[PDB]
Amino acid sequence: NGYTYEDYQDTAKWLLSHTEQRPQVAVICGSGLGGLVNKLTQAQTFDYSEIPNFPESTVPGHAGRLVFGILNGRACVMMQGRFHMYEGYPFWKVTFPVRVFRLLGVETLVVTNAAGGLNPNFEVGDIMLIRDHINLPGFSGQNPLRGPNEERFGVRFPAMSDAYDRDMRQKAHSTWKQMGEQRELQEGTYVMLGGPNFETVAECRLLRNLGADAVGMSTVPEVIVARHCGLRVFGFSLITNKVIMDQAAQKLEQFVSLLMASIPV
Amino acid sequence: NGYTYEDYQDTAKWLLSHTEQRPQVAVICGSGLGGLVNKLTQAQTFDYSEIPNFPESTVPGHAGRLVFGILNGRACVMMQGRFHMYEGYPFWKVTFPVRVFRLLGVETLVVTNAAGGLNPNFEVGDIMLIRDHINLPGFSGQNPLRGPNEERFGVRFPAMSDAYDRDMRQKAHSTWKQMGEQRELQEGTYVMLGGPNFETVAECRLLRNLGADAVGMSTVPEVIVARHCGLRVFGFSLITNKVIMDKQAAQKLEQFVSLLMASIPV
Amino acid sequence: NGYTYEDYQDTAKWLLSHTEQRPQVAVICGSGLGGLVNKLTQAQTFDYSEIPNFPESTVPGHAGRLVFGILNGRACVMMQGRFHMYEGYPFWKVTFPVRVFRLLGVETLVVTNAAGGLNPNFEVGDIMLIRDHINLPGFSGQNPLRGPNEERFGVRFPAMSDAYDRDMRQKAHSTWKQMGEQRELQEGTYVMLGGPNFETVAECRLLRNLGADAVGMSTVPEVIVARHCGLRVFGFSLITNKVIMDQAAQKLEQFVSLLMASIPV
Amino acid sequence: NGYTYEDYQDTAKWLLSHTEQRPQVAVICGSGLGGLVNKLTQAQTFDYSEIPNFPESTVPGHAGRLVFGILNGRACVMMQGRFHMYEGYPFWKVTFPVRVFRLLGVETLVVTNAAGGLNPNFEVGDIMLIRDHINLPGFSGQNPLRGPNEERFGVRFPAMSDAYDRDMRQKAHSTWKQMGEQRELQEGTYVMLGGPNFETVAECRLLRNLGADAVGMSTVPEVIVARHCGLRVFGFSLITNKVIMDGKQAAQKLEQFVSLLMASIPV
Amino acid sequence: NGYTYEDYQDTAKWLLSHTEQRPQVAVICGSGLGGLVNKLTQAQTFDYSEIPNFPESTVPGHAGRLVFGILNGRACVMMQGRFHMYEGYPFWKVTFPVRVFRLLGVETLVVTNAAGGLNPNFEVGDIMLIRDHINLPGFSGQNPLRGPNEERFGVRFPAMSDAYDRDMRQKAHSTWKQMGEQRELQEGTYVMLGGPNFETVAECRLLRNLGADAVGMSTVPEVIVARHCGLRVFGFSLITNKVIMDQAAQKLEQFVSLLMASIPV
Amino acid sequence: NGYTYEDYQDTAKWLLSHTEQRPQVAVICGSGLGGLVNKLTQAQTFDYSEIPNFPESTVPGHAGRLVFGILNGRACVMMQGRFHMYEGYPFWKVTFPVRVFRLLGVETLVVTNAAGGLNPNFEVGDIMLIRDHINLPGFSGQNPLRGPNEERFGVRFPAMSDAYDRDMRQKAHSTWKQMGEQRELQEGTYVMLGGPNFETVAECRLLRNLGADAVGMSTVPEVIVARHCGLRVFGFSLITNKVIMDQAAQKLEQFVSLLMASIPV
Numbered sequence A, C, E, F: 001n002g003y004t005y006e007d008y009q010d011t012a013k014w015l016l017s018h019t020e021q022r023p024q025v026a027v028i029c030g031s032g033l034g035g036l037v038n039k040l041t042q043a044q045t046f047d048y049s050e051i052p053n054f055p056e057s058t059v060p061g062h063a064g065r066l067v068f069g070i071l072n073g074r075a076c077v078m079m080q081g082r083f084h085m086y087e088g089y090p091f092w093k094v095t096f097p098v099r100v101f102r103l104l105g106v107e108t109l110v111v112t113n114a115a116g117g118l119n120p121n122f123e124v125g126d127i128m129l130i131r132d133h134i135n136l137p138g139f140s141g142q143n144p145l146r147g148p149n150e151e152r153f154g155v156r157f158p159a160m161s162d163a164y165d166r167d168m169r170q171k172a173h174s175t176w177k178q179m180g181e182q183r184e185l186q187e188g189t190y191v192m193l194g195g196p197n198f199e200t201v202a203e204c205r206l207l208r209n210l211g212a213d214a215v216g217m218s219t220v221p222e223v224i225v226a227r228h229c230g231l232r233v234f235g236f237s238l239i240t241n242k243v244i245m246d247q248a249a250q251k252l253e254q255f256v257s258l259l260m261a262s263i264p265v
Numbered sequence B: 001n002g003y004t005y006e007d008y009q010d011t012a013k014w015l016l017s018h019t020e021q022r023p024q025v026a027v028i029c030g031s032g033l034g035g036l037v038n039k040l041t042q043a044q045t046f047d048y049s050e051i052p053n054f055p056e057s058t059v060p061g062h063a064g065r066l067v068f069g070i071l072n073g074r075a076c077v078m079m080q081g082r083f084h085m086y087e088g089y090p091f092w093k094v095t096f097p098v099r100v101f102r103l104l105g106v107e108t109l110v111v112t113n114a115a116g117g118l119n120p121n122f123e124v125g126d127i128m129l130i131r132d133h134i135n136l137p138g139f140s141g142q143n144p145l146r147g148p149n150e151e152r153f154g155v156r157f158p159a160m161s162d163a164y165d166r167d168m169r170q171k172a173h174s175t176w177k178q179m180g181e182q183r184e185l186q187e188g189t190y191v192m193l194g195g196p197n198f199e200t201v202a203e204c205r206l207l208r209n210l211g212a213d214a215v216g217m218s219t220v221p222e223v224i225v226a227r228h229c230g231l232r233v234f235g236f237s238l239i240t241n242k243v244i245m246d247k248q249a250a251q252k253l254e255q256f257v258s259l260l261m262a263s264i265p266v
Numbered sequence D: 001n002g003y004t005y006e007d008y009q010d011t012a013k014w015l016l017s018h019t020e021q022r023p024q025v026a027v028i029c030g031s032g033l034g035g036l037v038n039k040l041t042q043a044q045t046f047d048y049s050e051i052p053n054f055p056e057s058t059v060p061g062h063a064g065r066l067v068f069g070i071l072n073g074r075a076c077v078m079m080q081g082r083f084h085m086y087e088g089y090p091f092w093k094v095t096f097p098v099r100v101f102r103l104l105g106v107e108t109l110v111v112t113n114a115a116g117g118l119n120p121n122f123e124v125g126d127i128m129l130i131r132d133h134i135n136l137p138g139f140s141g142q143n144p145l146r147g148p149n150e151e152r153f154g155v156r157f158p159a160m161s162d163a164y165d166r167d168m169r170q171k172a173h174s175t176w177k178q179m180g181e182q183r184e185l186q187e188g189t190y191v192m193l194g195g196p197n198f199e200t201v202a203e204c205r206l207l208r209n210l211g212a213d214a215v216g217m218s219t220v221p222e223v224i225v226a227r228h229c230g231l232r233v234f235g236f237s238l239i240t241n242k243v244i245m246d247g248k249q250a251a252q253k254l255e256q257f258v259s260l261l262m263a264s265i266p267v
């Protein structure tokens, strides 16, 4: 990790003095569900490129931005465009925004992503509530928490078993019903692996048998950092393709808006 | 990745202007399979050391060399000496030759390696056709494609489900009939891990139960990069040992690979 | 790597001239097993920080020292305080002391650690004789032996099938049944992952299915390096907790002291 | 050596595609001489931070921008804020903008800076036309051209003996007379050293003895990179202090002087 | 610079909580002048190797230490063994102790070193009060201040013209009188160059013509950092040799201890 | 410095076992003076690229090779193609061949280079015996000897005042008479700066007043490494241009060939 505590402080100060908004919830839009930014009122945008110490997108001319605004009666900050390990960023860079949010006053992080369905019951287009995750990179030591611990953020050995908020999942369901959805609200374990190439048939089977319902190349690192610093976490995976074992983004967007009401404080 | 597109190009040009040869198939010989380089005729050799941008071998006294020639009717370029992650090379160096091959005009990459047997039915001396792989290093982000995508080679999110060419696997099985050999041509999933130490009993069991048939510390990186830049891929693992679960065939493999040349399209 | 052979030597020569003791066995004490240093006689101590090329502990106020002496009438060298990958150290540093030991003349390495129980039959306070291990980081290439091989220490492809000495596993059991406890001596597979966060449920379940009986974030690197340079190896995990799938340290200590007599040569 | 040729192309292409302006001259504005960005007509700005591969400013709250515009009937590209070796940038990042300017089609580089006066006859407010320079970091190898030469920019061993365009210097003197100035236009050698600290007395005498007239911590790397890739170069120093051997006033003069010289720049 | 402001803080606090002394002045002893460490009563020592963030000596057998004590009613901290660019350390490590001293409450820095005599009138054994310096490495940018400026220590462009305290220079000559010496107290310009080879004849002549009186491979970096962070400064070179242009260590030692009285505060 | 003592040993062994020649003199040809290699009899060439640990040339199409052969009855090892700091090599690479030659048994290094004449009396085509040098990069610490000193090669602070052999210089003047050249054997101080650009007028004047007679971008690092490891050294600059202050190669070839006979043992 090449950031010092003060780097995080400097970026949060710079933001608090360039916007007066004071979000309590942050949201990381996955690939495709980035449209949630529009439909946020009193919008104020910052190019990641101009924020001090912020990682800068790779795809030239596709640089992301941090949008401060009101979603559905709640003050939030959202990431439009994210950083992945396969793009060459170390996790301490990928997850930098999360510790900044915490210092901005945020208390709840909502993560979303487009994933590959491993579970056969999932159909192209469904929404899966993340109840748990499997961190493959972490098994080898690739972890944003690697390095001496920063007490001012969290403890040395952060529990992860309860990473995803119990209450939020219940509410996620309740609020999915009122919507009057015909297709049910899926629920699974998300498995993160490096990328960028997609899985071989042998790997998909192995991951499935490993107990994974969906695969992606993101999110896990953010959640670990979020949980380490004490943020409340909950999030979803938009199954955009089922994996070879041998569009509907809009609904996730509004579903996320409504959810805002369910977040405490 | 510390190579820019032009690096690859400079290397291809240097080779293209230093040899009259114009290979259409590339072969990476596994450990103890370098004998396949003999058998090439009209051969021309280049030490890895003298080639611009080429990684140089680590193992003292094992130079490393690229050999161009005709095998059994087909123009080939061969690697005699391989690079491995356990030697300290990052995958962008291990797989560097592959992209040079593509820029040279190569269209098919043949991979070969010695591996340990996981499948209970496998015997020493068996030849396993690689039908698929499990890239364990890749589960943690160690990947030759990590970093921004170079579109002039291939796409950002390359598919791997069809990595090992289907028409070749069928031609492999049919051609093996003509080998005369008594034992069958095995087939399976090759799992790659880092090494250099061989597996423990719990690891062997664990890998077998994950669906792996053969274990090694190579090949997969090269396959990923080959598929990324559109090369057709087919290969084999010589089972030189049966892993603890609780030579007279390397020549056969060489002759089989020579035979198979005549079965590669165009 | 990062150290050359002469480094390991320089460090060995330094320790050799700074103490006349000539240990035959080395002991790496795990978390909480620090107390094995006391109950060692004619002890001579060296702070990690003053010994050439030795890595220095991260934890503030958690110094780190190498202790030479006599344990149960046996000359050995013990590490009070260890090095983990989650602290920021690459394995070529974590395992640096092991090769130094081989150069000192040590012929047997005893590894100790605190671990999480994955095997349902284990109870907190249990002592699990390490029978085998699963090196998860090793699968992705994180390995203290990565880089050109140093032939003066060992071979290119060392075998790991018989890492934990069969004879000591027999003599460990024969000796345990001479201390009497309502609980028998446990035996099993130690799986190592990076850290520093504790496991999720999905991961905990995953690891049990791999055939793991106990999780940790150390030890495996030292064992691999010890077998590579021909040291005899054996060790124990002290189950300090049971993993969630949906008054015992002093024991190990006297147990480890007893086994000294059972060590060959 | 940290950038590949394509990195410069990418950066140039991204600029050439975000603006239709096509500068013939680039100007690097010295310390506090940035008011000249005004005077520019049809200005189009781009913060350094947003341009691909561009170094980003260190001093918090000093952003830094590249402005394209017309000065006095002449297409220009100007740097508002610059990079210095003393801030931690290696010379290959400090001079990165100069190569991009060449790729944009710029043919002439105008460089200015604030400098400490070493010549005893200089006074605060003097403007010193740069006739030559002494590159001290260069004597130890810290050089923006270190590394394998990129032939597409220039030759391996470029000459520096004629770095500062003679014609432009004569035109600067003609131009200065036409402005009605009383205090003569000084002219001499600029010596660059690393910094960030100001010199000791023994260092100031030593530098004067090396033939230096003014001292600063910038400009020379850019000049060297500019000559290597063929740009014509002209520059001067605003003497803001007399060095110890034992202002904004001279601003709108500098800006008018630079504006006037635009018309004397060939082609 | 690899150190963040807080690294300087952690090192200062540590020293502060490990000793009760509160030095007001610091002394850096040059080659063959570490005897001064003694003469210090109430000596409390710390090996460099054990102080957090401290660089470690290079030459085997010379560990180097930081000693706190009294020199003449004067509470001070001294460096026995210093760091050099020629050894491989970047100037930001060479000068790390100076900023730590400042944070320990030190106000005055005394620097001493051994040097080659360029001034042909100097004689081996002479002591040369340092009046000015020439920082050759600084001409090409090798400077401990390179990098973003840290306001908490000093300004962006610190003056260096009055680096060697004028009053102390006067008290130094005086005090040399009331010490009754047979040789005059020399005073001149110290020029720092990299090393480690000694000068060629052409270099020596060149150096004398730059106005240098004594050449060496240290001190200047330390003085630059001290001045940058507000320390008063003065020092001496002990001319241990005359350079090819075509013993008295105890003295310097007693001279410095005498000067303790004349240091303000 | 990235090389360890054993890399040198490894490289020397590889060479000693790949040729039977055992030269006692090494010659480094200047860029442009590479014709000395032709003229060599019973030559055996090794491309730099195949020699373990050797730096490899950057100029594509100009391989660079080490040639072993007989010059004027004397066995030589010759470098055809040289390494320079301006090409990006650190001095520890530039001078790597020099320490290898010592390990091969070489006792004398003949350095050769093309340079710019500073002395107003020099004329193009002059040959200047190098009598002394000024190492500008060394004034700022860029020095092949930077880092821990390898006592197996030499001392910590090697003397440089007698770098260019006294006896070989007299011999060179005698041999020159025998060549009956219109012009005399010039003699002087070689100054080295980094490059790659050539000097401005102000720089030439300064370099000249520094006491330098010729300017180049090489040689000095090799000479320093040479003397540090006890090699005798002598060299010449071929003045190929008079610097702006406001063929003859065959001659240098014959000259060096004649001197082979005058080199000791």
Ligand SMILES: C[C@@H](Cn1cnc2c(N)nc(N)nc21)OCP(=O)([O-])[O-]
Pocket: A029, A030, A031, A082, A112, A113, A114, A115, A116, A117, A193, A195, A197, A198, A199, A215, A216, A217, A218, A219, A240, A241, A243, B157
């Ligand atoms: C590429 C995409 C994730 N992503 C989408 N589909 C897949 C798939 N089949 N396999 C893997 N390993 N990852 C997949 O990223 C979307 P994100 O930015 O929202 O994480």
Ligand SMILES: C[C@@H](Cn1cnc2c(N)nc(N)nc21)OCP(=O)([O-])[O-]
Pocket: B029, B030, B031, B082, B112, B113, B114, B115, B116, B117, B193, B195, B197, B198, B199, B215, B216, B217, B218, B219, B240, B241, B243, C157
């Ligand atoms: C060492 C050999 C591979 N290789 C051969 N046998 C084994 C085995 N049992 N386990 C592992 N992990 N690797 C094995 O390399 C052969 P290649 O270079 O052709 O891949």
Ligand SMILES: C[C@@H](Cn1cnc2c(N)nc(N)nc21)OCP(=O)([O-])[O-]
Pocket: A157, C029, C030, C031, C082, C112, C113, C114, C115, C116, C117, C193, C195, C197, C198, C199, C215, C216, C217, C218, C219, C240, C241, C243
């Ligand atoms: C933190 C402790 C290991 N350690 C103890 N319990 C656990 C657990 N449940 N999960 C993981 N991943 N590690 C665990 O380390 C102790 P050592 O230093 O003696 O290895």
Ligand SMILES: C[C@@H](Cn1cnc2c(N)nc(N)nc21)OCP(=O)([O-])[O-]
Pocket: D029, D030, D031, D112, D113, D114, D115, D116, D117, D193, D195, D197, D198, D199, D215, D216, D217, D218, D219, D240, D241, D243, E157
């Ligand atoms: C710091 C200022 C230059 N600069 C102005 N005065 C001096 C002085 N006396 N010494 C040194 N070394 N530099 C001086 O920079 C202004 P620029 O950014 O326009 O070059």
Ligand SMILES: C[C@@H](Cn1cnc2c(N)nc(N)nc21)OCP(=O)([O-])[O-]
Pocket: E029, E030, E031, E082, E112, E113, E114, E115, E116, E117, E193, E195, E197, E198, E199, E215, E216, E217, E218, E219, E240, E241, E243, F157
């Ligand atoms: C090597 C010694 C300095 N030092 C002593 N004599 C000389 C000399 N003739 N030339 C150079 N360049 N340095 C010399 O270091 C002493 P310090 O550690 O107190 O600076």
Ligand SMILES: C[C@@H](Cn1cnc2c(N)nc(N)nc21)OCP(=O)([O-])[O-]
Pocket: D157, F029, F030, F031, F032, F082, F112, F113, F114, F115, F116, F117, F193, F195, F197, F198, F199, F215, F216, F217, F218, F219, F240, F241, F243
């Ligand atoms: C470029 C050539 C040296 N070289 C030749 N002439 C000059 C000159 N005027 N200025 C500088 N700085 N260097 C000069 O290299 C020749 P070598 O490799 O034999 O040193």
Ligand SMILES: [Ca+2]
Pocket: A048, A049, A050, A051, A053, A054, A056, D049, D056
């Ligand atoms: Ca930025």
Ligand SMILES: [Ca+2]
Pocket: B048, B049, B050, B051, B052, B053, B054, B056, F049, F056
């Ligand atoms: Ca090579």
Ligand SMILES: [Ca+2]
Pocket: C048, C049, C050, C051, C053, C054, C056, E049, E056
């Ligand atoms: Ca230490």
Ligand SMILES: [Ca+2]
Pocket: A049, A056, D048, D049, D050, D051, D053, D054, D056
């Ligand atoms: Ca940017």
Ligand SMILES: [Ca+2]
Pocket: C049, C056, E048, E049, E050, E051, E054, E056
């Ligand atoms: Ca230390």
Ligand SMILES: [Ca+2]
Pocket: B049, B056, F048, F049, F050, F051, F053, F054, F056
């Ligand atoms: Ca090579």
